[PDB]
From a paper:
Ab326, Ab354, and Ab496 belong to the Class II type antibody that binds from the upper side of RBD. Ab159, Ab326, Ab354, and Ab496 exhibited similar or better neutralizing ability against Wuhan pseudovirus than the therapeutic antibody. Similar to the results of pseudovirus, Ab326 and Ab354 were ineffective against the Beta and Gamma variants, and Ab159 was ineffective against the Delta variant. Hamsters were infected with the Wuhan strain on day 0 and were intraperitoneally treated with 50 mg/kg BW of an N297A-modified antibody (Ab326, Ab354, or Ab496) or control human IgG1 on day 1. We mixed equal amounts of Ab326, Ab354, and Ab496, and administrated a total of 20 mg/animal (5-7 mg/kg) the day after infection with a Wuhan strain. Indeed, the live virus in the control IgG1 group became less than detectable range by day 5-7; however, those in all of the animals treated with the mixture of the neutralizing antibodies became undetectable by day 3, earlier than the control group. Live virus was partially detected in the lungs of the control group even at day 7 whereas it was undetectable in the treatment group.
To gain structural insights into antibodies and the SARS-CoV-2 spike, we performed cryo-electron microscopy (cryo-EM) analysis of complexes with the proline-substituted stable spike. Accordingly, we performed local refinement to improve the density for each Fab-RBD portion, which allows fine modeling of the variable domain of Fab bound to RBD. In this analysis, the Fab binding location to RBD is roughly classified into three locations.
Residue numbers in the entry:
A (entry chain G): 334 to 527
B (entry chain F): 1 to 107
C (entry chain E): 2 to 120
The structure:
């Protein structure tokens, strides 16, 4: 009867920035004890419902999204915050009410040589509306010259890698970010706590 | 369409920290380049990323600067395990013609 | 993460030869792919490139028409068909992916495939 949080929060692999695996979870009892205690949670900031009173209100339908972010720009994950991660590959709607979680992680997110498997979007024809997947590698064209479909003098591949290293610094190191979104009154509450 | 030339094409490098390779293009390339290495009878691997950027997996001795119409790779040591090809490659247009090649001696 | 190639051999001047390039590890359906030729005792030249969807086929102005290249994402392979070959084609072919201005696409090359058409 317990929610499959262990099936989302804890895992060995994750999408980089754009293949974020949106998992919808319902028909459960919501527990906000392990999350509330924070423990190793780097930043438990939540936009919308207060974090203290989460286990009181019965939500309708809840989604979990996960990805990895560079960290110096973790703040970009919030309503009405432009940038490069919040504007091209993961857009949060204005009326967002859920919570955002960030875990500091170097032990499991950086090989000795340096990870190159955390691609994130770099260019796009138009800004991305909230909550829209973007999984496609079609070469961009900065200039007027059409480069066809290989590359060009003003054409780039729209997926660059973070370039992680074990040392890096206090910033510029992988932060695993997971955001929970709640629907307001779609139907009678389906998940609630004790 | 685009044709390249690297002047030396052959050089002798005894004990010394000053070995350089010159690569030149017919048309203004800006800062689009690649410099690759190929050991005798082995699959070539990267040596320089683009114009003046390195690629993780090689020491910091290798260097290269200059954009637009002239390019110069330089090294600052010997480490007698890198005597191999120093091929020049373009990333400007679809023709993407390579260079000619180079060889390193032992004196 | 690796990639290998197969289909080489020695044949008469002028015939249909199909060679395959199979890559595992890095996802194959996201990046273009290039074929690069190296003649014995000489530099190396470029022949052709294929985009991710296999809709565009750029070639060098030396084997236009003779060569053809396609991809099979489900099989996760690159197929190169060369026909009406001539003597100078004798060389070693490498199946590669080449970076242009960013560190996104990897740069693996395999080993190669020798093909001489003297017969
Ligand atoms: C994900 O893993 C962490 C630890 O790796 C879990 O945290 C532990 O949870 C158990 C069970 O609630 C507690 O007894 C421990 O005190 C917690 N901390 C530890 C082990 O350091 C976490 O619960 C896991 N995720 C889920 C959804 O269960």
């Amino acid at each position: 009867n317990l929610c499959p949080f262990g099936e989302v929060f804890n895992a060995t692999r994750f999408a980089s920035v754009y293949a974020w695996n949106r998992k919808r979870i319902s028909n459960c009892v919501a527990d906000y004890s392990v999350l509330y205690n924070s423990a190793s949670f780097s930043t438990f900031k939540c936009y919308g419902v207060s974090p203290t009173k989460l286990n009181d209100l019965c939500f309708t339908n809840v989604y979990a999204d996960s990805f990895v972010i560079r960290g110096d720009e973790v703040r970009q994950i919030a309503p009405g915050q432009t940038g490069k991660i919040a504007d091209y590959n993961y857009k949060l709607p204005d009326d967002f009410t859920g919570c955002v979680i960030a875990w500091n992680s170097n032990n499991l997110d950086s090989k000795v040589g340096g990870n190159y498997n955390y691609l994130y979007r770099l260019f796009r024809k138009s800004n991305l509306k909230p909550f829209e997947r973007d999984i496609s590698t079609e070469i961009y064209q900065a200039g007027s010259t059409p480069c066809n479909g290989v590359e060009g003098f003003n054409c780039y591949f729209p997926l660059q890698s973070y370039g992680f290293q074990p040392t890096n610094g206090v910033g510029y190191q992988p932060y695993r970010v997971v955001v929970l979104s709640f629907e307001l009154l779609h139907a009678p509450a389906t998940v609630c706590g004790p | 369409d685009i044709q390249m030339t690297q002047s030396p094409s052959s050089l002798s490098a005894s004990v010394g920290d000053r070995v350089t390779i010159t690569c030149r293009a017919s048309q203004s390339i800006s800062n689009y380049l690649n410099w690759y290495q190929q050991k005798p009878g082995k699959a070539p691997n990267l040596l320089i990323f683009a114009a003046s950027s390195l690629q993780s997996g090689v020491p910091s001795r290798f260097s290269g600067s200059g954009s637009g119409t002239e390019f110069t790779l330089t090294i600052s040591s010997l480490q007698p395990e890198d005597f191999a090809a120093y091929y020049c490659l373009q990333t400007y247009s679809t023709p993407r013609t390579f260079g000619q090649g180079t060889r390193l001696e032992i004196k | 993460v690796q990639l290998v190639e197969s289909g080489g051999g020695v044949v008469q001047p002028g015939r249909s030869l199909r060679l395959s390039c199979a890559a595992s590890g890095f996802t194959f359906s996201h990046y273009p792919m290039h074929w690069v030729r190296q003649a014995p005792g000489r530099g190396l030249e470029w022949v052709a490139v294929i985009s991710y969807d296999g809709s565009n086929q750029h070639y060098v102005d030396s084997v236009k028409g003779r060569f053809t290249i396609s991809r099979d994402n489900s099989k996760n392979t690159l197929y190169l068909q060369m026909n009406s070959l001539r003597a100078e084609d004798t060389a070693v072919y490498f199946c590669a992916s080449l970076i242009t201005m960013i560190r996104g696409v990897p740069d693996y090359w395999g080993q190669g495939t020798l093909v001489t058409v003297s017969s």
